[PDB]
């Protein structure tokens, strides 16, 4: 019953697929800024995810824990890299609990490159790593996450470019990298039933 549900919630699901193009033109390769003098110049990221709702929406997990009220869990993340021998670069995957629920100055996007790189995270080198994993411990300050209300995301995940994506010089041809973001839950705690459920 509940066990089979918890097992299903631990199933990895492709949450996203990001394509990095050596062409260093858009804010796609924008690398972390050394400083942040104003909020108009926040830190640029390749992609971000508001957890745990993001993972509760993929693989049809939300419909699995329907009629349940509270959830407690750690978010598991895995990046599978697929790069060609000609594109070099290194990124940083970090998370920030309630990053959007605190004083602006205390946000990861409102600090220096030294600060951002100081958050809990893992590095990713295109020519060294084939994949990197990371665990996000239950970061809520509440005893549990309200599944029906779904307005309690307690952690933000970010993917920042430490260095610019270096590829061969050309205008006729583009060098690609791309990536596969997988996520799932662990340390799952599901409890209490309810006839109501998060509309989604």
């Amino acid at each position: 019953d509940t066990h089979s549900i918890i097992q299903f919630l631990q199933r990895p699901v492709l949450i996203d697929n990001i394509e990095i193009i050596a062409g260093t033109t858009a804010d796609a390769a924008k690398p972390l800024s050394r400083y942040v003098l104003d909020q108009q110049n926040s830190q640029k990221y390749v992609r971000s995810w508001t957890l745990p709702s993001t993972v509760l929406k993929a693989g049809g997990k939300a419909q699995k824990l329907a009629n349940f009220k509270y959830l407690r869990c750690d978010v598991q993340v895995k990046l599978v890299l697929n790069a060609n021998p000609f594109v070099a670069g290194r990124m940083y995957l970090a998370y920030s609990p309630y990053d959007d629920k605190v004083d602006t100055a205390r946000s990861v996007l409102q600090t220096s490159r030294a600060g951002v790189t100081g958050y809990p995270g893992v590095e990713l080198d295109f020519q060294l790593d084939n994949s990197v994993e990371m665990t996000i411990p239950y970061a809520s300050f509440q005893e549990a996450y309200d599944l029906v209300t779904g307005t309690e995301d307690f952690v933000q995940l970010y993917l920042f470019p430490i260095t610019p994506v270096l590829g061969p010089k050309s205008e006729s041809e583009s060098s690609k990298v791309d990536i596969s973001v997988y996520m799932w839950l662990s340390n799952i705690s599901l409890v209490i039933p309810t006839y109501r459920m998060n509309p989604d």
Binding site: A88, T117, I162, L166, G167, P168
Partner: peptide, 14 residues
């Protein structure tokens, strides 16, 4: 080689 970039980034941690 020209198959790659004529650059390389040097990251320094402290």
């Amino acid at each position: 080689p020209d198959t790659v970039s004529d650059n390389v980034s040097i990251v320094v941690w402290k």
